[PDB]
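We treat protein structure as text, and this decision shapes the records that our systems exchange. The remainder of this section carries one protein's record, kept here as part of the documentation:
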Amino acid sequence: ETITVPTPIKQIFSDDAFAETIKDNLKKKSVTDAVTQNELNSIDQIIANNSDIKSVQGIQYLPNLTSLNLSNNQITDISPIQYLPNVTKLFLNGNKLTDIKPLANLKNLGWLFLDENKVKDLSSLKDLKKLKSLSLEHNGISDINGLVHLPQLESLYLGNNKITDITVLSRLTKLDTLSLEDNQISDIVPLAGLTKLQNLYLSKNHISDLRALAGLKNLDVLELFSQECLNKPINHQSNLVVPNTVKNTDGSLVTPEIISDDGDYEKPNVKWNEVSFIFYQPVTIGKAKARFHGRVTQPLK
């Protein structure tokens, strides 16, 4: 798309706030000032954080735009971005996005930041062969199966979601930085062969078994605290015996730190409507030191 006659900024960029962004970027005096396509072609970078932007309609007239920061606005639709082929950096944190199908077209996208939106389907990212860094925290996401075809990603932040199944991650063999903190993950076996991983954030999941991590020799940063592990319910009895299922990287059992209701440990079992125990174990994997810590809860029926 091109404009062929000088046109007031507000007629092209229909959201007042975005119109103000373009006016400021071109150093104009008013959103009623006329712009030409030549002036719009001069826009290589937009910095428009914190601007109450509700729509980026009109942005399709910025062919040379390579970096676009729309953090912390109120945007609901990013379709006008889809035909901007030179965009390589896209900051969309803190908006109201649900659909990211229009990003499928951004073949040169390199960095994409989408935290604090409501994007729940990621299959739209499969086209993106130059995507190196993706952040999708706090989106309410459960299904990450669309991340199959970004096998060249280097950094992926998926913390603070509703993820249980990380099967697809075994294909993301270029990852050096991965966050899955504050999800619902118990099975970390899909990580076991991802030997390039350097930085791995796994706190606040449901992880009780570290065997999956035993071969990750390039780890430098590792976080493993505040797990919450929920056993399947068992019948209440006067004398309760529950196998300890908490395991170190070498498969040895982690001795409980504290056991509820004055219970005690007789290895491999913890003995006493619910009981629980807490564990805390410093671990080292490669150069990475972490504290493996959490609680196992046993409901009783």
Notes: Residues 1-43 form a domain with the Helicase, Ruva Protein; domain 3 fold (CATH 1.10.8.390). The first strand starts at residue 7 and ends at 8. The chain has three helices and 18 strands.
